[PDB]
Amino acid sequence: DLGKKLLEAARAGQDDEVRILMANGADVNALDDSGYTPLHLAAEDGHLEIVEVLLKHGADVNAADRLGDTPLHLAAFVGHLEIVEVLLKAGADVNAVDLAGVTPLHVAAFYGHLEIVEVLLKAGADVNAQDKFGKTPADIAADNGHEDIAEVLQKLN
């Protein structure tokens, strides 16, 4: 029961409740119906303090949901820069690949998040990684008309 409550508290940004639940033995790597962990939900919903506590309590930084996405994929998607930086510092795989062949750099390029692109590049993101349709992150940025990102990535092509 505590795993479900932890998923719910982490998603709802309930800092105090997350701490209470963990002190009561809640499984930090509990899964919901879609394969999300509390770290996935906190990362996606922009809950920085919870992301940090979950990691301290042994949340798997590279947990993959049903689609193969890590918390870093989700943070790069919604565009939470500080959460991306925290995930990276805690050992997130910068080049994690989901089922679609998509890396966090692909994600940031698609959603037009330039500052996240730059942080991912500094952390060693692979600019030559191709998704299942053969697209690099540069291809994606160009295709979706995000010119600032396309230009930075083209310096590495």
PDB file of C-alpha atoms in Angstrom:
ATOM      1  CA  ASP A   1       0.000   0.000   0.000  1.00  0.00           C
ATOM      2  CA  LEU A   2       2.872   2.395   0.820  1.00  0.00           C
ATOM      3  CA  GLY A   3       4.331   2.069  -2.708  1.00  0.00           C
ATOM      4  CA  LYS A   4       1.089   3.397  -4.219  1.00  0.00           C
ATOM      5  CA  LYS A   5       0.976   6.183  -1.615  1.00  0.00           C
ATOM      6  CA  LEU A   6       4.589   7.107  -2.462  1.00  0.00           C
ATOM      7  CA  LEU A   7       3.801   7.238  -6.209  1.00  0.00           C
ATOM      8  CA  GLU A   8       0.830   9.474  -5.395  1.00  0.00           C
ATOM      9  CA  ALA A   9       2.778  11.767  -3.027  1.00  0.00           C
ATOM     10  CA  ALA A  10       5.759  12.115  -5.389  1.00  0.00           C
ATOM     11  CA  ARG A  11       3.442  12.937  -8.303  1.00  0.00           C
ATOM     12  CA  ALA A  12       1.530  15.482  -6.143  1.00  0.00           C
ATOM     13  CA  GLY A  13       4.733  17.216  -5.011  1.00  0.00           C
ATOM     14  CA  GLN A  14       3.980  16.393  -1.369  1.00  0.00           C
ATOM     15  CA  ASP A  15       7.478  16.866   0.123  1.00  0.00           C
ATOM     16  CA  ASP A  16       6.590  16.102   3.754  1.00  0.00           C
ATOM     17  CA  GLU A  17       4.451  13.095   2.874  1.00  0.00           C
ATOM     18  CA  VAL A  18       7.256  11.611   0.708  1.00  0.00           C
ATOM     19  CA  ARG A  19       9.614  11.826   3.721  1.00  0.00           C
ATOM     20  CA  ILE A  20       7.073  10.263   6.087  1.00  0.00           C
ATOM     21  CA  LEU A  21       6.382   7.393   3.645  1.00  0.00           C
ATOM     22  CA  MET A  22      10.049   6.642   3.131  1.00  0.00           C
ATOM     23  CA  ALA A  23      10.639   6.726   6.904  1.00  0.00           C
ATOM     24  CA  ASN A  24       7.829   4.150   7.087  1.00  0.00           C
ATOM     25  CA  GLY A  25       9.571   1.854   4.610  1.00  0.00           C
ATOM     26  CA  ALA A  26       7.821   2.692   1.317  1.00  0.00           C
ATOM     27  CA  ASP A  27       9.487   1.157  -1.754  1.00  0.00           C
ATOM     28  CA  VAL A  28      11.339   4.024  -3.483  1.00  0.00           C
ATOM     29  CA  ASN A  29      11.224   2.019  -6.743  1.00  0.00           C
ATOM     30  CA  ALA A  30       7.492   1.150  -6.668  1.00  0.00           C
ATOM     31  CA  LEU A  31       5.890   0.924 -10.122  1.00  0.00           C
ATOM     32  CA  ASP A  32       2.508   2.206 -11.293  1.00  0.00           C
ATOM     33  CA  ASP A  33       0.376   0.613 -14.057  1.00  0.00           C
ATOM     34  CA  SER A  34       2.511   2.278 -16.790  1.00  0.00           C
ATOM     35  CA  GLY A  35       5.938   1.382 -15.319  1.00  0.00           C
ATOM     36  CA  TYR A  36       6.536   4.824 -13.825  1.00  0.00           C
ATOM     37  CA  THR A  37       8.550   5.040 -10.606  1.00  0.00           C
ATOM     38  CA  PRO A  38       8.166   7.893  -8.094  1.00  0.00           C
ATOM     39  CA  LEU A  39      11.290   9.422  -9.663  1.00  0.00           C
ATOM     40  CA  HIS A  40       9.649   9.443 -13.140  1.00  0.00           C
ATOM     41  CA  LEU A  41       6.598  11.254 -11.748  1.00  0.00           C
ATOM     42  CA  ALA A  42       8.543  13.773  -9.666  1.00  0.00           C
ATOM     43  CA  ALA A  43      10.873  14.527 -12.593  1.00  0.00           C
ATOM     44  CA  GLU A  44       8.034  14.964 -15.099  1.00  0.00           C
ATOM     45  CA  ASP A  45       5.969  17.182 -12.782  1.00  0.00           C
ATOM     46  CA  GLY A  46       8.853  19.503 -11.879  1.00  0.00           C
ATOM     47  CA  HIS A  47       9.149  18.515  -8.211  1.00  0.00           C
ATOM     48  CA  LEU A  48      12.842  19.243  -7.583  1.00  0.00           C
ATOM     49  CA  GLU A  49      13.072  18.642  -3.821  1.00  0.00           C
ATOM     50  CA  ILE A  50      11.344  15.251  -4.200  1.00  0.00           C
ATOM     51  CA  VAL A  51      13.635  14.230  -7.106  1.00  0.00           C
ATOM     52  CA  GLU A  52      16.611  14.955  -4.829  1.00  0.00           C
ATOM     53  CA  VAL A  53      15.249  13.045  -1.794  1.00  0.00           C
ATOM     54  CA  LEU A  54      14.199  10.015  -3.884  1.00  0.00           C
ATOM     55  CA  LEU A  55      17.734   9.773  -5.296  1.00  0.00           C
ATOM     56  CA  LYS A  56      19.235   9.962  -1.771  1.00  0.00           C
ATOM     57  CA  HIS A  57      16.946   7.080  -0.795  1.00  0.00           C
ATOM     58  CA  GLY A  58      18.086   4.852  -3.647  1.00  0.00           C
ATOM     59  CA  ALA A  59      15.679   5.621  -6.523  1.00  0.00           C
ATOM     60  CA  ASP A  60      17.020   3.960  -9.696  1.00  0.00           C
ATOM     61  CA  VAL A  61      18.111   6.984 -11.747  1.00  0.00           C
ATOM     62  CA  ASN A  62      17.953   4.915 -14.953  1.00  0.00           C
ATOM     63  CA  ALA A  63      14.577   3.235 -14.362  1.00  0.00           C
ATOM     64  CA  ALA A  64      12.809   2.669 -17.699  1.00  0.00           C
ATOM     65  CA  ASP A  65       9.002   2.957 -17.962  1.00  0.00           C
ATOM     66  CA  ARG A  66       6.891   0.807 -20.344  1.00  0.00           C
ATOM     67  CA  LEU A  67       8.078   2.875 -23.329  1.00  0.00           C
ATOM     68  CA  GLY A  68      11.726   2.618 -22.287  1.00  0.00           C
ATOM     69  CA  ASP A  69      11.899   6.221 -21.064  1.00  0.00           C
ATOM     70  CA  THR A  70      14.034   7.205 -18.079  1.00  0.00           C
ATOM     71  CA  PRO A  71      13.333  10.096 -15.693  1.00  0.00           C
ATOM     72  CA  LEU A  72      15.890  12.086 -17.745  1.00  0.00           C
ATOM     73  CA  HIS A  73      13.858  11.493 -20.929  1.00  0.00           C
ATOM     74  CA  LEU A  74      10.810  12.940 -19.147  1.00  0.00           C
ATOM     75  CA  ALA A  75      12.668  15.908 -17.628  1.00  0.00           C
ATOM     76  CA  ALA A  76      14.148  16.771 -21.043  1.00  0.00           C
ATOM     77  CA  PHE A  77      10.634  16.561 -22.527  1.00  0.00           C
ATOM     78  CA  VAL A  78       8.859  18.970 -20.162  1.00  0.00           C
ATOM     79  CA  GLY A  79      11.982  21.125 -20.062  1.00  0.00           C
ATOM     80  CA  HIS A  80      12.902  21.190 -16.366  1.00  0.00           C
ATOM     81  CA  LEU A  81      16.540  22.291 -16.550  1.00  0.00           C
ATOM     82  CA  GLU A  82      17.518  22.023 -12.862  1.00  0.00           C
ATOM     83  CA  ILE A  83      15.977  18.530 -12.639  1.00  0.00           C
ATOM     84  CA  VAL A  84      17.951  17.480 -15.746  1.00  0.00           C
ATOM     85  CA  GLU A  85      21.146  18.734 -14.052  1.00  0.00           C
ATOM     86  CA  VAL A  86      20.358  16.908 -10.802  1.00  0.00           C
ATOM     87  CA  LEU A  87      19.607  13.651 -12.677  1.00  0.00           C
ATOM     88  CA  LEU A  88      22.876  13.931 -14.571  1.00  0.00           C
ATOM     89  CA  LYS A  89      24.893  14.576 -11.381  1.00  0.00           C
ATOM     90  CA  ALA A  90      23.259  11.486  -9.796  1.00  0.00           C
ATOM     91  CA  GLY A  91      24.510   9.294 -12.659  1.00  0.00           C
ATOM     92  CA  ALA A  92      21.665   9.310 -15.199  1.00  0.00           C
ATOM     93  CA  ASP A  93      22.653   7.687 -18.497  1.00  0.00           C
ATOM     94  CA  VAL A  94      22.827  10.740 -20.799  1.00  0.00           C
ATOM     95  CA  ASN A  95      22.446   8.474 -23.853  1.00  0.00           C
ATOM     96  CA  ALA A  96      19.667   6.196 -22.557  1.00  0.00           C
ATOM     97  CA  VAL A  97      17.660   4.863 -25.461  1.00  0.00           C
ATOM     98  CA  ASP A  98      13.876   4.227 -25.310  1.00  0.00           C
ATOM     99  CA  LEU A  99      11.905   1.774 -27.488  1.00  0.00           C
ATOM    100  CA  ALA A 100      11.641   4.398 -30.213  1.00  0.00           C
ATOM    101  CA  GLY A 101      15.475   4.675 -30.304  1.00  0.00           C
ATOM    102  CA  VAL A 102      15.064   8.137 -28.787  1.00  0.00           C
ATOM    103  CA  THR A 103      17.757   9.606 -26.489  1.00  0.00           C
ATOM    104  CA  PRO A 104      17.276  12.557 -24.127  1.00  0.00           C
ATOM    105  CA  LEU A 105      19.085  14.759 -26.695  1.00  0.00           C
ATOM    106  CA  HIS A 106      16.508  13.708 -29.345  1.00  0.00           C
ATOM    107  CA  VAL A 107      13.773  14.656 -26.862  1.00  0.00           C
ATOM    108  CA  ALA A 108      15.236  18.082 -26.013  1.00  0.00           C
ATOM    109  CA  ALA A 109      15.767  18.792 -29.735  1.00  0.00           C
ATOM    110  CA  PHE A 110      12.193  17.849 -30.628  1.00  0.00           C
ATOM    111  CA  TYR A 111      10.653  20.007 -27.874  1.00  0.00           C
ATOM    112  CA  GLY A 112      12.942  22.958 -28.589  1.00  0.00           C
ATOM    113  CA  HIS A 113      14.704  23.192 -25.231  1.00  0.00           C
ATOM    114  CA  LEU A 114      18.030  24.830 -26.107  1.00  0.00           C
ATOM    115  CA  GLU A 115      19.466  25.152 -22.592  1.00  0.00           C
ATOM    116  CA  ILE A 116      18.724  21.479 -21.917  1.00  0.00           C
ATOM    117  CA  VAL A 117      20.389  20.613 -25.238  1.00  0.00           C
ATOM    118  CA  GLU A 118      23.510  22.478 -24.050  1.00  0.00           C
ATOM    119  CA  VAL A 119      23.575  20.762 -20.650  1.00  0.00           C
ATOM    120  CA  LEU A 120      23.156  17.353 -22.327  1.00  0.00           C
ATOM    121  CA  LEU A 121      26.009  18.095 -24.757  1.00  0.00           C
ATOM    122  CA  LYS A 122      28.311  19.077 -21.852  1.00  0.00           C
ATOM    123  CA  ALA A 123      27.414  15.777 -20.187  1.00  0.00           C
ATOM    124  CA  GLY A 124      28.503  13.847 -23.301  1.00  0.00           C
ATOM    125  CA  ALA A 125      25.245  13.300 -25.229  1.00  0.00           C
ATOM    126  CA  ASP A 126      25.824  11.407 -28.493  1.00  0.00           C
ATOM    127  CA  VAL A 127      24.994  13.699 -31.444  1.00  0.00           C
ATOM    128  CA  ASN A 128      25.233  10.801 -33.908  1.00  0.00           C
ATOM    129  CA  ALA A 129      22.624   8.607 -32.174  1.00  0.00           C
ATOM    130  CA  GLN A 130      19.870   7.588 -34.617  1.00  0.00           C
ATOM    131  CA  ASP A 131      16.285   6.800 -33.629  1.00  0.00           C
ATOM    132  CA  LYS A 132      14.316   3.893 -35.183  1.00  0.00           C
ATOM    133  CA  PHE A 133      13.545   6.098 -38.212  1.00  0.00           C
ATOM    134  CA  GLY A 134      17.242   6.906 -38.717  1.00  0.00           C
ATOM    135  CA  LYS A 135      17.013  10.469 -37.364  1.00  0.00           C
ATOM    136  CA  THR A 136      19.796  12.165 -35.366  1.00  0.00           C
ATOM    137  CA  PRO A 137      18.917  14.895 -32.832  1.00  0.00           C
ATOM    138  CA  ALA A 138      20.104  17.454 -35.454  1.00  0.00           C
ATOM    139  CA  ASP A 139      17.717  15.917 -38.007  1.00  0.00           C
ATOM    140  CA  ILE A 140      14.894  16.297 -35.471  1.00  0.00           C
ATOM    141  CA  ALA A 141      15.717  19.936 -34.619  1.00  0.00           C
ATOM    142  CA  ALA A 142      15.901  20.865 -38.320  1.00  0.00           C
ATOM    143  CA  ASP A 143      12.704  18.910 -39.222  1.00  0.00           C
ATOM    144  CA  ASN A 144      10.774  20.705 -36.453  1.00  0.00           C
ATOM    145  CA  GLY A 145      12.195  24.132 -37.277  1.00  0.00           C
ATOM    146  CA  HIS A 146      14.114  24.707 -34.036  1.00  0.00           C
ATOM    147  CA  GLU A 147      16.949  26.625 -35.656  1.00  0.00           C
ATOM    148  CA  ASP A 148      18.960  27.626 -32.558  1.00  0.00           C
ATOM    149  CA  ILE A 149      19.293  23.931 -31.647  1.00  0.00           C
ATOM    150  CA  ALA A 150      19.885  22.823 -35.236  1.00  0.00           C
ATOM    151  CA  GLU A 151      22.792  25.302 -35.492  1.00  0.00           C
ATOM    152  CA  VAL A 152      24.519  24.229 -32.230  1.00  0.00           C
ATOM    153  CA  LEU A 153      24.250  20.535 -33.193  1.00  0.00           C
ATOM    154  CA  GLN A 154      25.556  21.244 -36.719  1.00  0.00           C
ATOM    155  CA  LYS A 155      28.842  22.408 -35.155  1.00  0.00           C
ATOM    156  CA  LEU A 156      29.357  18.726 -34.286  1.00  0.00           C
ATOM    157  CA  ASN A 157      28.327  17.272 -37.669  1.00  0.00           C
TER     158      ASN A 157
END
